[PDB]
């Protein structure tokens, strides 16, 4: 842009210089020496002089003609010999060298820039959220106050990088935060607080803050943030659920008090190896298989679907419906004891989780946690010798390996699995490049940080048409009224009446479900509906069915 | 400088021109018997050196060949090598050489007078500069830190010099004698060194910002014309804002300021609690409640409930904000006074819930600024 | 690459030449009725583009003027801009661009086979390289450390790649499948990661240098074809050299080696004293006498007098030298075995008084080297 | 050198190309078209073609002539249009940019380099030894293994800088250590040991090692070093001598057992304010004023010389002669108590000194000395408040301020002198740029590290014709034999007879001395000689006087 324009702007000047001279010449030849020259001769002459070719076939004779020739000559040397080779070189050669040779840190965004997604605080999660959602070519812009880090992210991108204080309002003004589509506040909690209060001072643009300590959750909504994600606590959960010898029930959401969305690791459970229709999970409980999570993907349930031990079943149903699956697994193993190696915010979160549903564990680390005063820790280097065995890794029913270094995690998983082939080992993979290797070391399940993080933010980013809608709302299930047996969702006109929206229609006699049905969907008899609206829209719903 | 070297070389070139154009007209006459008009001589000489080469005006004698060969090369050496080099070197070097690698300015020009020497850059001084360059005073900051001279050179509005502020030779190059005023905002021992050294070269007025108020008379002693105990003052402004029985003021942060503020609330007896993480390396006369205020029930275990005032005094604004935000959530009616190092965060401490905010940079600049034009 | 782009552009230029020289001869004939020999066409075309401009062969019709104007510019664009650029860009860029700022090599060519991947550079491997490039094997070292890739790139004899040795995509670019052998000389957890990852891409032989000998079977388990417990071995070589009653051997230095050596002198019961400064982060089974050996009567308070042998095992050669020098001064007849990390200091440990010197780099290279060509 | 040669080598080729072409042309014109051209025409043509001037007055006509013209044309564009502008630019423009833009670290010395002085371990002392002895333009070469430090020393020099391991023998080989004049080993003691053992492996070049811990002195001579300087211990001495309220006697050398070279701070002594002849120091004791040290300079004593309080008197005489000056000062003040603020190697050395001649002191510091277990230290920050007064700085007779930071030293000296105007304050100046300011703060005397260091090394460097001669020798004084009353030193021919050398001849009845007398010096009656030879040369001396 700014360099190419300067180029052919200067070419327009040169062509003007040409056409001018070629005519001044034809004038002089006529008015000085009495020679009528064709126009092309004027061009041909002028070119020949400036370019310093100088054929000498067309020359002047009067001193006056000498002067104008001398002039045109120099004008060739100044503008075709100096500037034009300079400009061709300066606009082409400078970018390759000046910008690799020394950083020219981008400090501001263009005036017109809109629709971008501001990333504040780069790390494995966000870096993975970027590589994943640039598959829709969103304009991802990351920001850093760290000069040497802006260097790295500028040479390898994918995403434009800005260098500056994320709290300085003037900086945020140059980032056109008002015209932004969404802002990801992935800094420290006090910086996240500063960040939000500052953005709320310039605009109202949606801010998804990733909070470290879950207690600071309400404090960041308070700082302005539209949605808060306690990632460290969540990953701890996913670890504690994966470690419980027999796959246990995990509660995801309490939609008012009507419906519970939950999940279940199929491992060590009578549904493992068995299929969906074979297990007949919906039939015996009345539950709703809203989706199955196997190989890092969200898929719709099928009857012919075999549940691997590695699988995770999402659920939806009443409190007495979930209860029916805590008995269809369904007995706890005697002498449970889970080693949690690593007392980060995650290992601590996981230990807080295994506390919530009482399973005794041992927290092993090297130094004491700067954050936690409520967890007793066994102190000692796990890498060095008999440390795990002195704690008694022998009577353990599960090892959760939670170091912030993947290479170490691998080496423990490798060390444990060698030492005990049959025990449940759950590891944690910061960088998702090491996921495959924790499995290959012997991990029964691997929780990739980057992957789980990106998936949450990603979903919260493209659901951001109704994510703050979904926030502060209740989701419910309604047995489809027989009056609408055979009628379209569109023909029924449910949303203009009630305000609720259909997200899923399952079969009357099947574990199969149709999720996010199109407006042209013809309803069926007995088909069980599951919708999302306000608490009060679930309410006025029952009329607009009775009304019409 | 670089421009002078350019058109000095253009004067030489025009001399070369007028000379050659006349040597030519001489030769044509004295070698081959051709009288050429002066303009023809210029026109020829230009045509040769510029290597255009029309060939309408040529010599014939071997002698004429020689002078033509000479004028030809002189064109290639001075219009083909130097003049494109010089146009490129004076224009292209500054954009690249100076962004690409630092050429640290080590000295001030001979004639430089009326400048205001800044020694020890920080939020205060940086704010004193943006504020008093609205009268376009020549602000010159100095640092012994190479990597810091880099930052301040690319972003300016003030020229930056790299060198030891205590080395007398350095101060001599800074023309301290002809200076209008000197701001000594370093450590107390450095400030002392700085003054004793300037008093050795001149008598130029020196406004020293003293950290520990006891060292105040020691710096006037080092030469300083006026001494400003900024940390003590900001503590005062905090203690005054927090009172305005069962009075009880939490002071979160035991810096020199929170300690100054606690020393202030002592002077007019109001009971307070000093909360911090580590013990103050400077104070042995204030009892401190030790514990991280960010982590959980720390403030409540001290009893933030029967408190009539919280003074939030961390040296990090983002943390101050997050406390003010945390306190005001926890207690809507109590007087919360916060402190804003960088004045970019002032608005946000208010927005968090601060009943009053004391901006360091702002209060500092205002004092120095006033002391500078009242000088 | 860069050379190809050059004479590819020369082929285009010669095409431009032969084309123009014929278009010209055509025009002269079809425009003005002048038959020109082919060489005249070349000679003209050269003369125009090169901007020489003799003016002996010129057109007269406006049409001829146009084609001449065209050929003229085509000379200025392709002989005046690109050809001097390209000669400069392919020649001048490598000397400057690559010394001036690093362009870190991130990947290996498609066809690269028969190479020996080095993972984890240090005195041993660096010595294994200088020794086995006497058969001109393609040694490629890898590092995730940017500033270390710089050093190893300017001083080589081995190509350097910058990247995570555990990232599978990185290993894919290194053509690990077509590799001849891989040397895993990282930490034990990294070595484990490294192997499990290579075993995921290929089955290429991996010689892992294991630090703690207990992790030996764990690395064969990670895939490694052969495991070398170098630290344990060097300890052995030290313990053997120090015996060869009242036998009593001082082992100065409680590294993995001095600890290995002490474990060795345990296996065939000879009483010793382990002297160090801090406690070993790895060993809880060796009692150590704590105290700085450099500072005064430390060795004599332990009783270096009734000792039958000193094993000097510091990870600094200059210190080892200074101890060996200090001991041999203090006791001429006692058996002193020292350890030489860098083999540049071997001669000096002898010269200080070492009865035998165990060079780390040398013993390491010899083992790996043998394991590499016996492979 | 290497770049200029490549330039005019290429100019020789160009002129060859010229003279060749100009003759090929004249040949062709004759053998192709039948035109005899003068030689100058050939040059003139050839120039005109290659330079792309192209007058077109002299052209060919045959196709053959076209070819050779086309050839000469291109040869102009390749060698006058590409290389010659490149080479003019590359040899001129590269040094200014390539070398400022990125370091090209000098890794080796030229083959022929001899007579240089290798500096190993740059610091205030050596940097001052360099600025001082480049006033004789010696080739000072400093060496460092620190890349970022080689950068600094290369841009500011004065002295060429080499980058490499000073212990690596190959490195030392490139430094041509064999052809070296002298080597200064100013590294750590183990590095100094390594350095010497390595140099002794390549050559025998003289090595002056600056030893930190004085106990390691004999260990470095053992490593090869020809002379060892325990600088830290010496500076401690100079501090302890300066602090003793009344100027005390300090013993410099025990030449066998015959003669003692000593010194005396004149401060607080009855010679202060008084002159040399007025005090009549030589007269009452028999001592020899070998030189006076006032303002950082070594000067010959004069009778009309006033001894300031700041002065230091060097001495030479027997054990009973020095004794006579420990009573002419001469009484110790009651209640002596010296604060030594700073427990470095120097403050510790100074405290070890004030121990040797029992004066009670207080060692104050912040942390405990990693090196000393024999000095009890009062721990506490001296900058912070009542720390000095709680130790009782009130009953102190002297403060020695010995921090490794000058700005702090200044601030203490400034703080003490404020607190106590009359007490003896001795400070220490690392960098000699701060010396003036310690005085201006109130220091009664300032010991500049850099200055005292350079002066020792400097002297040891230019005395290196007889420094190792002076080492292991004894210096003596002899009452000039009356037989040589009126005879020259040269006429006497003392050195070929005895082997001793005259360094000083003083007057029979004067405190004045003539030092390093020229060979043409006519002796006098009673004039007292002081010479330097071997222990055994002082012996055989008494014959060669009795012989003739
Ligand atoms: Ca991996
Ligand atoms: Ca802000
Ligand atoms: Ca060596
Ligand atoms: Ca100074
Ligand atoms: K012509
Ligand atoms: K003609
Ligand atoms: K021409
Ligand atoms: K021409
Ligand atoms: K030309
Ligand atoms: K040109
Ligand atoms: Zn915890
Ligand atoms: Zn305090
Ligand atoms: Zn051990
Ligand atoms: Zn001591």
Numbering used by the authors:
A (entry chain B), D (entry chain B): 17 to 564
B (entry chain A), C (entry chain A): 18 to 261, 350 to 480
Task: Reproduce passages from the article.
Two full-length channel structures, wild-type channel and L97D mutant, were determined at 3.7 Å and 2.6 Å, respectively. First, instead of forming a single straight helix, the long inner helix of GsuK is segmented into three parts, labeled TM2A, 2B and 2C, respectively. Second, rather than forming a bundle crossing right below the central cavity as seen in the closed KcsA structure, the four inner helices of GsuK are more parallel to the central pore axis and generate an elongated, water-filled vestibule that spans twice the length of the KcsA cavity. As shown in the pore superimposition, the inner helices of the wild-type and mutant channels diverge at the glycine gating hinge (Gly92), but converge at the C-terminal end of the inner helix where the bundle crossing forms. Although the intracellular gates of both the wild-type and L97D mutant channels are closed in the structures, the structural difference between their ion conduction pores suggests a distinct pore opening mechanism for GsuK. The wild-type channel exhibits cooperative Ca2+ deactivation with a K1/2 of 197 μM and Hill coefficient of 2.3. GsuK has its intracellular gate at the end of the inner helix, distal from the canonical bundle crossing seen in KcsA, allowing for direct coupling to the gating ring through the extended linker.
We demonstrate that GsuK is a nucleotide-activated and Ca2+-deactivated K+ channel and reveal the structural mechanism of multi-ligand gating of this double-RCK K+ channel and a distinct pore opening mechanics. Ca2+ stabilizes the closed gating ring by binding at the inter-subunit assembly interfaces and deactivates the GsuK channel. While both NAD+ and ADP anchor their adenine rings at the same site on RCK2 by using the conserved nucleotide binding motif, they utilize different functional groups and activate the channel at different sites.
